[PDB]
Design a protein around this ligand. Sequence first.
Ligand SMILES: [Mg+2]
Ligand SMILES: [Mg+2]
Lengths: 108, 108
Amino acid sequence: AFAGVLNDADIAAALEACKAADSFNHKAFFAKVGLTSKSADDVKKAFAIIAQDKSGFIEEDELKLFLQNFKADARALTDGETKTFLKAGDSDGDGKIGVDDWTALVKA
Amino acid sequence: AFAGVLNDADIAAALEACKAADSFNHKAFFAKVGLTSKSADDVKKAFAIIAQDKSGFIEEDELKLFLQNFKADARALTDGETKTFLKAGDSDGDGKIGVDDWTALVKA
Ligand SMILES: [Mg+2]
Ligand SMILES: [Mg+2]
């Protein structure tokens, strides 16, 4: 779903790098996919694409499927990767990731 | 210290991928650097080079500096990366990483 929003080579490359289960790192992915260098405004648009809503939240079970926003049939994150990802991103501690959580995490 | 054991292209790309603090992932690094696909025997050699010896162990403070085995002036791992690394790796529970710990973790 990031067709036109991020570089296709970047998306491919970010996915390639975490293809093996338990090899994902969100800080690595954000940089490689090209999100970290975007402005907070474009980071917000990226959130919207993923949560399907600027006011939405990414829940744990949806966070598990993070990669599949960039390539439909990418692997699922393992439960370990999801837990690590959620815990780093969920600053406001509601057990999920909203737009504020997200924007801070990408720019971190 | 791996000049001639691993490809220089591989070593540079593995380090490139985790150049940002807190972006390191050992499964990612081990595959990119080319350790995961080598024979256990070749994996044990890599351990003696790092640990200086087949009977040695990689302890916490040494693991912190894991990247500098591949490139002398590579960055130090943060305490978070290091704690994650040691926990994943230390199967025999002694709080450090020996050759059996290493071999199993590399081949995981
Ligand atoms: Mg939250
Ligand atoms: Mg041990």
